[PDB]
Amino acid sequence: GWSKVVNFLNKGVQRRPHRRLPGQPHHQWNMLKTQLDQLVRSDRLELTLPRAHELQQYAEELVHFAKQNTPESSLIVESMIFTPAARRKLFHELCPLYANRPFFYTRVVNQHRLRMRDAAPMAYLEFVDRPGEIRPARPVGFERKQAIWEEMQATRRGRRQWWNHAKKLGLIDEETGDVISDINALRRPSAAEWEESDSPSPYKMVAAPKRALEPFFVDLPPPTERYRKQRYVFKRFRP
């Protein structure tokens, strides 16, 4: 090429909202559908930047419609997954998670590098507020209020800047015109928690950080290490 044609042709051309994909629409939709399930099952995927900016559109809608907990919404959620494992995870680990998160459960990170074999850009599509995340996420709900109160109590500048905002949240005592002293008073029960229903055993489980541990040892690799397979097989040339 010439590198000038690109510029000459692009004059007075509108941008496309939805990025084109190789194949018929029926194929494209299938592709995106399957990639959504694969993204749900992993927690981070490595994809090209254009594609990473495209899959995030449905990545948000899936979680947005999964939290309604309605027959109608359930249908739409059903209409966007394939495998049962993704359904299970979405309905048992992600829904409880984003209980207090209004929106924006995903992000895109650019790698600023080119593929060796393709010379193409690369990016990561990782969920927000997940173990081993690239960067930490901000608090929401009562956590946010506590953060804000901390900020306020830290220094004068924070107090001044958050003065207006604090009023709405109720962190300012109207009876004395000062920041609330006790912040735990604004604690409320969240949806994620378990409502109240109202031993000397040797087989008792042991507390541990993600899931408990059994009092017995089982000779078994992790879930991700008990099923091996060759990634790729060479194809001999036929001269």
Binding site: Q24, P25, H26, W29, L75, S79
Partner: protein
């Protein structure tokens, strides 16, 4: 009809369409006279409308269903089955003739 001439007009017909808008809203009426069918659309907001009356109504949930903006049941519409065709000049892929394909198989 004519303000100067003081000529009025009275039309009668059955409602066929009600275009729901803000200011450009209109209603379409259809009738027959001596076997010839006539149709006329009248805007809602017009200064010429002398009077408007209803002779017979059809109050029922069916009318309410038509008088409401419904939402898609599912996101299946994105499939776009009508686009799944075969090129005339394209390679033979199965036993499908040139044109739109079928989903039974």
């Amino acid at each position: 009809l004519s303000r100067s001439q003081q000529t009025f007009a009275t039309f009668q017909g059955y409602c066929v369409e009600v275009r729901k808008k803000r200011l450009n809203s209109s209603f379409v009426l259809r009738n027959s006279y001596e076997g010839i069918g006539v149709e006329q659309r009248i805007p809602l907001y017009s200064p010429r409308i002398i009077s408007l009356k209803v002779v017979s109504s059809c109050a029922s949930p069916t009318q309410d269903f038509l008088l409401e903006r419904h939402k898609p049941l599912t996101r299946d519409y994105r499939y776009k089955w009508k686009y799944n065709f075969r090129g005339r000049w394209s390679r033979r892929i199965g036993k499908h003739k040139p044109g739109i394909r079928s989903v039974e198989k």
